[model samples]
Target: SCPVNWVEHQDSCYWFSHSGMSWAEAEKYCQLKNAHLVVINSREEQNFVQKYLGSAYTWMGLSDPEGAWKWVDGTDYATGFQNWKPGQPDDWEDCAHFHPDGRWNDDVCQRPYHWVCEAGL
Candidate 1:
């Protein structure tokens, strides 16, 4: 079990937002509840999220402001795991978005997107 309004998964609590917000905005807003934008750490983690991903753009914690990609939780890029869509990180933009089909893509940071927040159990 987890806090009220948050769903518990294996080791963390997750909250999916109902309103759209910018990546940066969501980041700080999540902090209000002592959470950060979701940081996926394993295939099981990805699997759980994909079930709720559906067919809309959602924000994740990955971003590369200038090729310095990092997760909000400080999960190292190389070992934290990745599910980027092919041709992603295309320098097409800066922030990472969760795809409807359960993958990731880079886009503008200020784009209004629904986001998932995560915290410890």
Candidate 2:
């Protein structure tokens, strides 16, 4: 059976769950399925994910470990559609992940949360 709450955009169908999972593992899992983790397409898309997202935070494909901010697809951070929390990336937050609790955070790469996947890659 197919996964639930999946959105098809362009040539990709995004699948995400409320169950929490870490960013790194999610990426690996998605790749194994011939897909890439969902990269934030826009604020509306993010909010759409947030709405179903429960108390635990989910991992999106945004991360920057050393000043190089990039997505799983190797795209740089777009200047638009970003509503990041204040003082974010304060030098410690090298990785980017979103919380379902109405905020975003930088956390250790291993934290677990439900993840998003892009079939179009």
Candidate 3:
């Protein structure tokens, strides 16, 4: 079972915010609930995430710092699925957020955007 109003899928629970905020602030919000910014681990899970996002860009769990990309929860980037757009992830000053097309995009973390959180059930 999952917390009230949280969506459960596979072995995890997810929560989506109705409000927009900075990626860092959104990350903290999820962590407060024992969750973290969602690390989309597979193509199937990506579909699940896309269905929840409304007509807005959403903040995701992954980010690129220094040079190597990594998940916020220490998940390795190489193993996980990536749908980064072509010619994307350019030193665009690193932080990952959902693209309108279901791809992950890097942008300034200070930008306000809606986000989803995920935790194991």
Candidate 4:
């Protein structure tokens, strides 16, 4: 796992910043933090995130290069936890991340974006 930039919440860590990376690179970034991009398990989680992140773009473990919705961690899309901006995954791009306001957008991964790193509790 790789290290991710995020702030600790109650039992989880969160990133309410902006990130611009290809799906693969974003995944690696999260792994480096020993965590994967957020899986958006619940609206509460989404709400918390949307609330925490206001206008920045953050990456949320979702991407499909060959036209398959998969998390950067190589996992199938979660059963009720995925969010997209509509007509996304058209493979129009090769990378993605979430905006601080809970919006999804695909783009190149090398761009610099403020990220949240989480550590300890």
Candidate 4 per-residue lDDT, tens place, 19-73, comes to 3454456556767766666666566766766666646566566555675566554
Candidate 4, after superposition: displacement of residue 73 in Å? Answer: 3.6
Query: Model 1: per-residue lDDT, tens digit, 13-89?
Result: 99988888999999999999899999989889999987887466999998886568889888998877899999887
lDDT values for all models? 0.87, 0.68, 0.86, 0.58
Candidate 4: C-alpha lDDT: 0.58
TM-score of each model, in listed order = 0.93, 0.75, 0.92, 0.63
Candidate 4 lDDT score at position 57: 61
Per-residue error for 108 in candidate 4, Å, reads: 4.7
**Candidate maximizing TM-score:** 1
Clashes of each: 0, 10, 0, 20
For this target, which candidate reaches the highest lDDT against the unseen true structure?
Answer: 1
User: Worst 10-residue stretch by lDDT in candidate 1?
Assistant: 47-56
User: Tens digits of per-residue lDDT for model 2 on 10-82?
Assistant: 4457776656666777888889877787776676667666665566666778787676777888755766356
lDDT, candidate 1, at 75: 90
Task: Look at candidate 1 and tell me the lDDT of residue 94.
Answer: 89
